[PDB]
Write an enzyme that holds these catalytic residues in place. Structure first.
Site, mmCIF file in Angstrom:
data_model
loop_
_atom_site.group_PDB
_atom_site.id
_atom_site.type_symbol
_atom_site.label_atom_id
_atom_site.label_comp_id
_atom_site.label_asym_id
_atom_site.label_seq_id
_atom_site.Cartn_x
_atom_site.Cartn_y
_atom_site.Cartn_z
ATOM 1 N N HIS B 62 -26.092 -12.716 7.648
ATOM 2 C CA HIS B 62 -24.721 -12.124 7.516
ATOM 3 C C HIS B 62 -24.901 -12.640 5.977
ATOM 4 O O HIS B 62 -24.007 -13.419 5.248
ATOM 5 C CB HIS B 62 -23.540 -12.971 8.129
ATOM 6 C CG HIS B 62 -23.770 -12.414 9.876
ATOM 7 N ND1 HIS B 62 -23.407 -11.749 9.943
ATOM 8 C CD2 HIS B 62 -24.898 -11.899 10.443
ATOM 9 C CE1 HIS B 62 -23.199 -11.098 10.898
ATOM 10 N NE2 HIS B 62 -24.047 -12.029 11.526
ATOM 11 N N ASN B 135 -19.005 -10.343 15.782
ATOM 12 C CA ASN B 135 -18.684 -8.899 14.947
ATOM 13 C C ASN B 135 -17.860 -7.722 15.083
ATOM 14 O O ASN B 135 -17.212 -8.192 15.469
ATOM 15 C CB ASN B 135 -19.915 -8.745 15.127
ATOM 16 C CG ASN B 135 -21.221 -9.275 14.783
ATOM 17 O OD1 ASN B 135 -21.774 -9.947 13.982
ATOM 18 N ND2 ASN B 135 -21.914 -9.172 15.222
ATOM 19 N N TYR B 349 -27.493 -22.369 15.635
ATOM 20 C CA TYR B 349 -26.538 -22.266 14.537
ATOM 21 C C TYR B 349 -26.318 -24.217 14.088
ATOM 22 O O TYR B 349 -25.630 -24.357 12.947
ATOM 23 C CB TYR B 349 -25.156 -21.855 14.662
ATOM 24 C CG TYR B 349 -24.757 -20.625 14.786
ATOM 25 C CD1 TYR B 349 -25.739 -20.403 16.247
ATOM 26 C CD2 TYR B 349 -23.851 -19.905 14.049
ATOM 27 C CE1 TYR B 349 -25.202 -18.839 16.235
ATOM 28 C CE2 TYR B 349 -24.324 -18.325 13.967
ATOM 29 C CZ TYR B 349 -24.578 -18.125 15.004
ATOM 30 O OH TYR B 349 -24.269 -16.626 15.525
HETATM 31 C C1 HDD Z 1 -31.384 -16.495 17.723
HETATM 32 C C2 HDD Z 1 -30.919 -16.332 16.041
HETATM 33 C C3 HDD Z 1 -29.621 -15.981 17.045
HETATM 34 C C4 HDD Z 1 -28.347 -14.622 17.359
HETATM 35 C C5 HDD Z 1 -28.957 -14.449 18.698
HETATM 36 C C6 HDD Z 1 -27.235 -14.446 17.273
HETATM 37 N N1 HDD Z 1 -27.257 -14.973 15.347
HETATM 38 FE FE1 HDD Z 1 -25.934 -14.826 14.463
HETATM 39 N N2 HDD Z 1 -26.903 -15.916 13.110
HETATM 40 C C7 HDD Z 1 -27.731 -16.892 13.139
HETATM 41 C C8 HDD Z 1 -28.701 -16.738 14.396
HETATM 42 C C9 HDD Z 1 -28.170 -15.972 15.297
HETATM 43 C C10 HDD Z 1 -27.898 -18.387 12.147
HETATM 44 C C11 HDD Z 1 -29.164 -17.663 11.578
HETATM 45 O O1 HDD Z 1 -28.309 -19.416 13.255
HETATM 46 C C12 HDD Z 1 -26.663 -17.796 11.604
HETATM 47 C C13 HDD Z 1 -26.670 -18.014 9.900
HETATM 48 C C14 HDD Z 1 -26.029 -18.601 9.075
HETATM 49 C C15 HDD Z 1 -25.417 -19.670 9.897
HETATM 50 O O2 HDD Z 1 -24.549 -20.400 9.800
HETATM 51 O O3 HDD Z 1 -25.882 -19.019 11.423
HETATM 52 C C16 HDD Z 1 -25.744 -16.487 12.248
HETATM 53 C C17 HDD Z 1 -24.851 -16.259 11.195
HETATM 54 C C18 HDD Z 1 -24.162 -15.243 12.118
HETATM 55 C C19 HDD Z 1 -22.734 -14.748 11.572
HETATM 56 C C20 HDD Z 1 -22.175 -15.249 10.210
HETATM 57 C C21 HDD Z 1 -21.305 -16.392 9.651
HETATM 58 C C22 HDD Z 1 -20.992 -16.731 8.503
HETATM 59 O O4 HDD Z 1 -19.583 -15.721 8.428
HETATM 60 O O5 HDD Z 1 -20.746 -17.848 8.415
HETATM 61 C C23 HDD Z 1 -21.977 -14.661 11.831
HETATM 62 C C24 HDD Z 1 -20.681 -13.497 11.779
HETATM 63 C C25 HDD Z 1 -22.893 -14.129 13.620
HETATM 64 N N3 HDD Z 1 -24.223 -15.110 13.219
HETATM 65 C C26 HDD Z 1 -22.655 -13.057 14.713
HETATM 66 C C27 HDD Z 1 -23.386 -13.551 15.953
HETATM 67 C C28 HDD Z 1 -23.334 -12.539 16.711
HETATM 68 C C29 HDD Z 1 -21.991 -11.470 17.011
HETATM 69 C C30 HDD Z 1 -24.584 -12.474 17.569
HETATM 70 C C31 HDD Z 1 -24.790 -12.299 18.959
HETATM 71 C C32 HDD Z 1 -23.264 -11.739 20.160
HETATM 72 C C33 HDD Z 1 -25.341 -13.304 17.018
HETATM 73 N N4 HDD Z 1 -24.877 -13.790 15.511
HETATM 74 C C34 HDD Z 1 -26.698 -13.386 17.358
#
Ligand code: HDD
Ligand code: HDD
Ligand code: HDD
Ligand SMILES: [Ca+2]
Ligand SMILES: [Ca+2]
Ligand SMILES: [Ca+2]
Ligand SMILES: [Ca+2]
Ligand SMILES: [Ca+2]
Ligand SMILES: [Ca+2]
Ligand SMILES: [Ca+2]
Ligand SMILES: [Ca+2]
Lengths: 675, 675, 452
Positions: B62, B135, B349
Site C-alpha cells: 500500500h 480494503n 503492523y
Molecule cells: C501478515 C502481514 C499482513 C497481512 C495478512 C495483511 N497486511 Fe495490511 N499491511 C501489512 C501487513 C499485512 C504491513 C506490512 O504491516 C503494512 C505495511 C505498511 C504498514 O503500516 O503496515 C500493511 C499495510 C496495509 C494498508 C495501508 C495502510 C496505510 O494506508 O497506511 C491497508 C489499507 C492494509 N494493509 C489492509 C489489509 C487488509 C484489509 C488485510 C487483510 C484482510 C491486510 N492488510 C493483511
C-alpha cells in the site's frame, strides 16, 4: 521553553498505551490459566517492543558524563570586541545546559578514571544555539583531526578482548604517545592532578582552539575560551581515585547533583584571552596549534560573564544522553580558525548525531531545540515532528514571496565568515613546520608544578608505564619523556628497571607560567559542599552526643556531614559496612568511640581504623575530638604534631582549626619525594 | 487545525539553521572566488545532510496512497451493542484521518493500476486511537497471515529484473493464484470494476475480518465493518485506466484533493452486519474465514454514523506518508476473532513501523499522537520527545504511589478481551476443514454481476493470462477458473489458445447476492464533482460564447467544467495538446468548433476528434451543442440516436439530457458480448 | 568475484530458518484448530519480520532506475596522459556495473517520463573502485551544490498533496527555472528529445564536470567524460511517451534486459575531451562552470576504450537497488576540479548511503565491494561483516610493525591531489563573474537542432 511543553506527568491516572487506550501491563493474555501466550496480546508487545528498543549508541568518545541546566549572565556590553548577541548588554541572561564527561570509558565506567574530561556548554541565545565544546585541559593530544581515530583506538581497550576499560595504562596507548610526540603536552596534563579532578565543579573548562571574535564592522581578533572555577581547583590522589572507581563509579555526577539540589550550584567566570591577528606567530608558537597555551604572562584574562548551573534534569536519557553538541553551532560575532583539529571537528559532530539519533531530525529533540523561531527549507526525514506550512521550500521562489530571506553580513543578523580571512598556496596534505616543537610547552607545564606535584606526575607515569608489556614500547616512551625532561626520564626509568637515555637538551628550559598548578593555587575559596565523616559508635551514649554537637557546628557552615556507626539509628547516616574514606574530604573520630580503633559481624575487621588511616595517607584533614586523643592517633600512627591533624577537647576550637584544613584541602608533606 | 500545535510558519522572516542561527544557503564558502569548497561551511553541510536523508522506506504494501482529515459523527447511542466510547451518543464527533491506496505498486506508481485498494481509517477517540485498516474489497486472497509474503512476492515484480510494476499480469502471480485456490474470490473482485475504481470517493471500505463488539457487561457479538459510499459506486474501463496511468498517475489523489478544496468532501455511512456468536458456522461457511462475505440477504446493514473527509493535509510527508496504522490500535468495546489472517496482522503492523520510522517512538509523530493523555512506563528509545517526570516507572511501586493505575474490565475503562472467548484442543499448524470451499463464493460473486459486467471480468482475465509465458501455469489457471465456472474457463481459454478442461460441477450454483455489482447499483446519486470537457475553438468567436454559456449552466449544478481550445485565453482552461478523454466524465463539442473534427503545430494530428471518439468508446455521455451535429457525429462514427449521445440546439435542453447521462455514468450497450 | 561467494541456490532442499533449522511456513501454530495464533510461533515471526523490513529508503534522486553488469576494455596504454591503472594497457579488461535512471520520479514511476537521466558507471579496477556518476545530458541546472535541494524541491511534487509525479509540468518547477537563469541550458536539453530517449542504449553518458587527468610525474590536464552510444541516438515523441508511461512503465528496463538476454548487449565508446590547464578560461566561458559544454569544434573526442553491458543481475534488490555510487570513488591518475557543483557532491554521496543502508558498512555489500584487498583501520559499526586480525588499528604504531603503510605520490600507488593545484584570496560565499552568461549556450544548443 521547548522542554516545558514536552513534560509528562504520571503522578495520577490510569495506565494507557502510547495511543491513549487504558490498559493493564502485569499479566500476559494466555489460552487457559496455565496456557501459552497469544500473539494478539498487543499490551504485551507494545511494552516489550518499547523496552527492547530503549538503548541508543553511546557517544563515540565522552560516553560517560552528566549534565545540568543553568544560566549565563554577561558582565557588560561587549560590542566593542564582538557582535555576539548573548554578550551585547550588562546583565543579559541566556539559559545554558552543560555536560561534563571523561573521554575513553564506555557509559557505565567510573567517573574517577584518569583521563581528559569534557566540559561542553550550550548557550540558547536569542540569535541561535551556541556550543563551546571544551575540555578541562587547555591543549589536545593531536594537531590534525584526521588522527582522532588513531588516538582513540590507541587509548580505548585492545580490540581482541576489549581490555582495559577507561585507562591509558596499556601497551597501545603508550605506543601511540611514544610514536606521536605531539601527545606530550596533553599527556603531561592528564598525568598530573588534572587527570583526576575532585569534581566537575573543581576543574576549569577550555575551548582549546583559538577562535575569532568578529565585530559588526568585520574586524576580528583571536581568542581562547577559559572557564575559571569559582569553587577552586582540586584533585584526588591516584590511590583514592582507584578505590573510588569501585566504591562509587557515580562520584562526580552525584557530587554535581547534590551541590545543585542543596542551593550550591557551581559557578564559572567565562573569560577570554584576546590578541590581535598579527600575534598569531608572535609568542614563539602558532595560535593555530592546539597543543599550545598562551601563557598567562603573555595575554591576561578578560571576564565576560558568569556561568551558573542550578537545576538538574527531569529525565537523564531525554536531556543528558540526548544532548547533541556541535562546534558548528556558532553565532554571528564568532568565527573559526584554520586549526586543522578544529577544522575536522566541524564535520564530525554533524555526522555522528545520525548514528546516535538514527535519523536526521535530532535538532527537534527538546534539549537540542533553540529558543527562537526556525525558518528554513529543510524537510522530511525520519522522525519529522514539524508540519511545515510553506509549500514552496526552495530559493529562489516567487510562490512564497521570496521567504525565507537570505541573512548575511548586511542583513538579518546573518552569520558571516570573518571578511579579513584568506587562504593561499598549494593544496597540500603537509604539516606546517610551525607545529614541530612538541616538547618545550610540556616542560613549561612541568616546571610550573610544585615539587610534590611533579612527584605525583612521575608516580602516575611510573604506575602506567610499569603495566606496559613491551620492552620496546617502554624504551620508546623513555626516549620521548627524555626530550621533555632528563630528570623525569631518569625517575620513571628507575621504576621499570631500564636506563634512561642520555640527556638531549634541545627543548630543556627553566621557564614557568602561572595558573596551571593545582597544588600551588592557594586554599579553596569556599568549603560549602565538602564532605565530613564523623566516626562514632552506638556503644557509648557520649559518642553520639559528641557527633551531634559536631554535626550542628559543621552543618552551620555548609558542610555535608555523615555520622558513621556500627548500625543505623536516629542521628546516624551510614554504617561502617558501607563507609569509606573516599566518601569524605575530612574525617573526625569522636573520642567516645576510641574502643573501635584497636572485630564485629556488622562490618569487616579493622574498618573503623582503615577509614581514618586511609584519609590520613590520602592527605586529608583528620582529627580526634574530645580531649582523650593520643589513643586514636597512636593506633593509626598519625603524629599529633602533623600538619592537618587536629586534637582538641573543645568542639568550637576543633571545628575552627578543621575548617582551615578543609580549605587547605590536601596536606602534601605526607608524600615521599625522589632523591 | 487538528495538528495546529505542530505547524511551522515560513511566510515571514530570515533563513535560519535548525538551531535558530540566521544564515544564507545559496553559495558555498570557498578558498577564493574560483576556489574549492571549505569543510568549515556548516551552512552547506546541515542543508545537504537534511536533503541526503529526506527519504524513508515506503510501506511494504500500500506504498502508493493519499490521505485526508475529517470527522465521524455517531447516529445514536450504541452502548446497547458496544462499550466503544466514540459510538456512545447521538451526534458525538471524533476527528479522523483516512489513507486510501493501491497494494502492489511502489510509491510513484499509477493510481489507476488494476489492484486491490486500501481504505484505512483512524478515529482519534476520547478513549484512544482506533484504526480500522480496510480494503475496497470485502474478502482477502489468503486464509493465514503467514502466507502474506508468498502472496506479495508473487504479485510484486519478478525479483531478478523488478518487472512488472503495479500489475498482476505476469507468470508468478497467476502461478500463485492457480496453486493457492483460496485466492479465487478476491481475484474475481480485482478482475471486476472493483479493481479499477473511478475514485477513492466512489468505492466502499471493508474491515474484511469478523471482529467482536463487546458490551460493558462482557457479552459480545460478531461484526463486519462496511463503509458505504454516499457518492455511489463507479469504475473506469480497463483501456481508460491504462491511458490514465500515463496521462495522470495522480488521478485518484488529485480527485480527492479537488473535491475537498471545492466543499464536496466525500462521505460514507459507517455500518456493520451484527450476528450472534452462535452464527459463526450457521451461514454455510466459517466467519473466521476472511475469503467469505456474509451475503446481504443473510444479515442486514446497521448504519452507525457518518464519515466525512473535509480537510486536506498541510504537509504530505509529515501527515500522509508518516501515518502508521495498526489493527492493534483497538479500544474498549471492540475485540479480535481467531481469524488466522487477522491474528498475524496484529504482529506485523507494530513491527513494520520500526522499519519506516527507524526508531521505536513512532506514536509520538504528530499524525500518530492520540488526543487524550498518555500515562505509561515506556521510556527512552531513539527520537524520544517526552520528558517524563515520574522517576519510578515500574509496577508495582510505592515510590510513585502505585501510579499509573492498572486499567481492566472493572476500572479505568480498560480494554478487556471478550470474557466468553476460549480455546480448546492441540497446538496445531493445521488448516480447519471449515475453510476448504474456495469456489462457491467466487461463483456467487460472478452470478451477481450484469451480463456486460461478467464480460468485463472475462476480458480482464483474458488480458492478464494472455501475458503469462508458461503454458503449464496457463493450464493450471484454467483448472482453477473451471472449478468456479465452466463458462468462464471456456471464454478465457478462447483468448489464450487452450482448451478449457471438462466441467467439474462440485461447486456450481445459481445463487446471487445484492450489492456487489457496480453496473447494477443504479444511477449515481449525485453528479457534483463530475468532469465535463467542452471542446471549442479560438477560430470562431461564437464557439467561445457557446462554451461560456454552457460553463455557467453546468457549473450551477456543481460540475467541474474544462473548456478546451487550440490555445489559452480568458475562459479557456486547457489546450488540446494537454487534454485527454481520461480527463472527463462527459465530453461536449460546441458546433461552432465543427471544423476541428476532420492538423496544427499546437496539438497532435486528430487530437480534437480522438478525445470525442475515446470518450464515446469508453461509454461516456458525449454530445454536440448548437443544433449542427451530423458533421462531428459522422467523423466520430457516433450514431445520433445512440443511448448517451446528445444533440440539441437549446443550451438548457442539452444540459438537462446530458446530466441524466452523467448520472447513468456509463453506457454499457457500446460493449460487445461473447456468443 | 565478491558476488560469487554470496550466491544462494534454492533449486533444491528443504525450507530452513535463517539459522539453518528445517521448518514449515504455510500455517500458523494455533491453540486449537479454530484457535488464536501463539506467540511462541518463531516460524511465523522470523518470516513476517523479514517481510515487514524488506523495504529501504529510495534514493533521494534517481530513485527509478535499472542496471546491468559488463566489461570495459582499454584501447591503448594511456600512461602518457593519466596514471590510471584501468587505462594502462591495450586490451586491459575491468568489470563494470552500470545503473541508468530518471531523476525526479519515485520508485514505481514511469521510465518514459520527461526528465534528465542518470548514467552511473562503476569500474572495479585493480587499484580500487572508480565511479563516473553521469547523466545523459552534458550540463546541469545549477552552478553550486548548495542549491541542489532548491532545484529538487521545485521539480518534485508539491509537498502539500505530493502532485505531480515525475514531471516538471507544474508551477514550482517553472518558478525555479524562471528565477534561477543558470537552469536555461539543461532546461533546453530536457525539453528536447534528450528528455524522452528511446532507450538507455540510445542515449549517451556525460560526467558533466571538468575533471583532471594526472600523470605519474604530477602534471595534469583538464578532461570531460563522454560515453558515445554505438546503437545511435534516438527519442520518443511526447504523445508516445505519455501513452507508454501507462501501457508499460517498465519500458526502458525491459528493453535493456531483453537486449542483454538476446546477445545484443549495448556498447559505448568511453571518450574524453582533453585540454591544457591554461585553457580553463580560453573558450569564452569557465571550465569550472557545469552549465557549459566544450563545443565539439573546440576540442575533439579521444576514444579510450569500450564499455559493453552483457549480463543481467541475479537479484535486482541486492545488486541494482543496493549499488551505492560516489564521485569520491576515485583512483590514482584522476583528480577533482574547483567546480562548486562537483565539490559539494563529494560530501553528499558518502552521507546519503547512511540513510539508504541504515549503517556505515555499506561498502561491504557485495555489489559495493572492490576486487582487491582492503587494508585500513576502519572498525566496528552496525553490520560489520569482517573479522579484523590487526589488533593495533592506529597509526603510528610499532605493535603491528607500522602496517598499514601510508600510500602517497611516492609509495603504494597512493592517490594524490594534482600537485599544481592552488588556492588564493578571501574566504567568500560569492559567485565568480565568469559564471554569469546563462543564455548563450542555451541558444547554441537550440540553433543546432533541425527545424522539426
Ligand atoms: C501478515 C502481514 C499482513 C497481512 C495478512 C495483511 N497486511 Fe495490511 N499491511 C501489512 C501487513 C499485512 C504491513 C506490512 O504491516 C503494512 C505495511 C505498511 C504498514 O503500516 O503496515 C500493511 C499495510 C496495509 C494498508 C495501508 C495502510 C496505510 O494506508 O497506511 C491497508 C489499507 C492494509 N494493509 C489492509 C489489509 C487488509 C484489509 C488485510 C487483510 C484482510 C491486510 N492488510 C493483511
Ligand atoms: C575529529 C573528531 C574529533 C576531534 C578531533 C575531537 N572530537 Fe570531540 N567529539 C567527537 C569527535 C572529535 C565526536 C565523535 O563527534 C563526539 C562524540 C559524540 C558527539 O556529539 O560528538 C565528540 C564528543 C566530545 C564531547 C562530549 C560532548 C557531550 O558531553 O555530549 C566533548 C566535551 C568533546 N568532544 C571535546 C573535544 C575537544 C575539547 C577536542 C579538541 C580540542 C575534541 N573534542 C576533538
Ligand atoms: C549536492 C547534492 C548533489 C548534486 C549537486 C548532484 N547530485 Fe547526484 N545524487 C545525489 C546528490 C547530488 C545523492 C543524494 O547523493 C544521490 C542519491 C542517491 C545516491 O547514491 O546519491 C545522487 C544520485 C545520482 C545518480 C544515481 C546513481 C545511481 O544510479 O544510484 C546519478 C547518475 C547522479 N546523481 C548524477 C549527478 C550528476 C551528473 C550531477 C551534476 C553534474 C549530480 N548528480 C549532482
Ligand atoms: Ca593494549
Ligand atoms: Ca560569509
Ligand atoms: Ca513473473
Ligand atoms: Ca465495471
Ligand atoms: Ca507546483
Ligand atoms: Ca526528437
Ligand atoms: Ca537506523
Ligand atoms: Ca595529496
Amino acid at each position: 521553553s521547548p522542554l516545558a511543553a514536552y513534560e509528562v506527568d504520571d503522578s495520577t491516572g490510569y495506565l494507557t498505551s502510547d495511543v491513549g487506550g487504558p490498559i493493564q501491563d502485569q499479566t500476559s493474555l494466555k489460552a487457559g490459566i496455565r496456557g501459552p501466550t497469544l500473539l494478539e496480546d498487543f499490551m504485551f508487545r507494545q511494552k516489550i517492543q518499547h523496552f527492547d528498543h530503549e538503548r541508543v549508541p553511546e557517544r563515540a568518545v565522552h560516553a560517560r558524563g552528566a549534565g545540568a541546566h543553568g544560566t549565563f549572565t554577561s558582565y557588560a556590553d561587549w560590542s566593542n570586541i564582538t557582535a555576539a548577541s548573548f554578550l551585547n548588554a550588562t546583565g543579559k541572561q541566556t539559559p545554558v545546559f552543560v555536560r561534563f564527561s571523561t573521554v575513553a570509558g564506555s557509559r557505565g565506567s567510573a567517573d574517577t578514571a584518569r583521563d581528559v574530561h569534557g566540559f561542553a556548554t550550550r548557550f540558547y541565545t536569542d540569535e541561535g544555539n551556541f556550543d563551546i565544546v571544551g575540555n578541562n585541559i587547555p591543549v589536545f593530544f593531536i594537531q590534525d583531526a584526521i588522527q582522532f581515530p588513531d588516538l582513540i583506538h590507541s587509548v580505548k581497550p585492545r580490540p581482541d578482548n576489549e581490555i582495559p576499560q577507561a585507562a591509558t595504562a596499556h601497551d597501545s596507548a603508550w605506543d601511540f604517545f611514544s610514536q606521536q610526540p605531539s601527545t606530550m603536552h596533553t599527556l603531561f596534563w592528564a598525568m598530573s592532578g588534572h587527570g583526576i579532578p575532585r569534581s566537575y565543579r573543581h576543574m576549569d573548562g577550555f575551548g582549546v582552539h583559538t577562535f575569532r571574535f568578529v565585530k559588526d564592522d568585520g574586524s576580528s581578533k583571536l581568542i581562547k575560551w577559559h572557564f575559571k572555577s569559582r569553587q577552586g581547583k582540586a584533585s584526588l590522589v591516584w590511590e583514592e581515585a582507584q578505590v573510588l572507581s569501585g566504591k562509587n563509579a557515580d562520584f562526580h555526577r552525584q557530587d554535581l547533583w547534590d551541590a545543585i539540589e542543596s542551593g550550591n550550584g557551581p559557578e564559572w567566570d567565562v573569560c577570554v584571552q584576546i590578541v590581535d591577528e598579527s600575534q598569531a606567530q608572535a609568542f614563539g608558537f602558532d595560535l593555530l596549534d592546539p597543543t599550545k597555551i598562551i601563557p598567562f604572562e603573555y595575554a591576561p584574562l578578560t571576564k565576560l560573564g558568569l556561568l551558573k548551573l542550578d537545576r538538574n534534569p527531569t529525565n537523564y536519557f531525554a536531556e543528558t544522553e540526548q544532548v547533541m553538541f556541535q562546534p558548528g553551532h556558532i553565532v554571528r560575532g564568532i568565527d573559526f580558525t584554520e586549526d586543522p583539529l578544529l577544522q575536522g571537528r566541524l564535520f564530525s559532530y554533524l555526522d555522528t548525531q545520525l548514528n546516535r539519533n538514527g535519523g536526521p531530525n535530532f535538532e527537534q529533540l527538546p534539549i537540542n531545540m533553540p529558543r527562537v523561531p526556525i525558518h528554513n527549507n529543510n524537510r522530511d526525514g525520519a522522525g519529522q515532528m514539524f508540519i511545515h506550512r510553506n509549500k514552496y521550500p526552495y530559493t529562489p521562489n516567487t510562490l512564497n514571496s521570496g521567504y525565507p530571506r537570505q541573512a548575511n553580513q548586511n542583513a538579518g543578523r546573518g552569520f558571516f565568515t570573518a571578511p579579513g580571512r584568506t587562504a593561499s598556496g598549494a593544496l597540500v596534505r603537509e604539516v606546517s613546520p610551525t607545529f614541530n616543537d612538541h616538547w618545550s610547552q610540556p616542560r613549561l607545564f612541568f616546571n610550573s608544578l610544585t615539587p610534590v606535584e611533579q612527584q605525583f606526575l612521575v608516580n602516575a607515569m611510573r604506575f602506567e608505564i610499569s603495566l606496559v608489556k613491551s620492552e620496546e614500547v617502554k624504551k620508546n616512551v623513555l626516549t620521548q619523556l627524555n626530550r621533555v625532561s632528563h630528570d623525569v626520564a631518569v625517575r620513571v626509568a628507575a621504576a621499570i628497571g631500564l636506563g634512561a637515555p642520555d640527556a638531549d637538551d634541545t627543548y630543556y628550559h627553566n621557564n614557568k607560567t602561572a595558573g596551571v598548578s593545582i597544588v600551588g593555587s592557594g586554599p579553596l575559596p569556599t568549603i560549602k559542599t565538602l564532605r565530613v565523616g564523623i566516626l562514632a559508635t552506638t556503644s557509648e551514649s557520649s559518642a553520639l552526643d559528641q557527633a551531634a554537637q559536631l554535626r550542628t557546628r559543621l552543618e552551620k557552615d555548609g558542610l555535608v556531614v555523615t555520622v558513621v556507626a556500627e548500625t543505623l539509628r536516629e542521628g546516624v547516616d551510614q554504617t561502617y559496612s558501607t563507609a569509606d574514606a573516599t566518601g569524605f574530604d575530612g574525617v573526625v573520630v569522636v573520642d567516645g568511640a576510641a574502643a573501635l580503633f584497636a572485630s564485629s559481624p556488622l562490618f569487616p575487621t579493622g574498618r573503623p581504623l582503615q577509614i581514618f588511616v586511609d584519609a590520613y595517607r590520602w592527605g586529608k584533614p583528620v582529627g580526634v575530638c574530645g580531649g582523650k586523643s593520643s589513643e586514636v592517633l597512636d593506633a593509626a600512627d598519625v603524629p599529633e604534631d602533623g600538619d592537618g591533624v587536629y586534637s582538641e577537647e573543645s568542639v568550637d576550637m576543633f571545628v575552627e582549626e578543621f575548617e582551615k584544613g578543609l580549605a587547605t584541602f590536601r596536606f602534601t608533606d605526607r608524600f615521599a619525594l625522589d632523591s
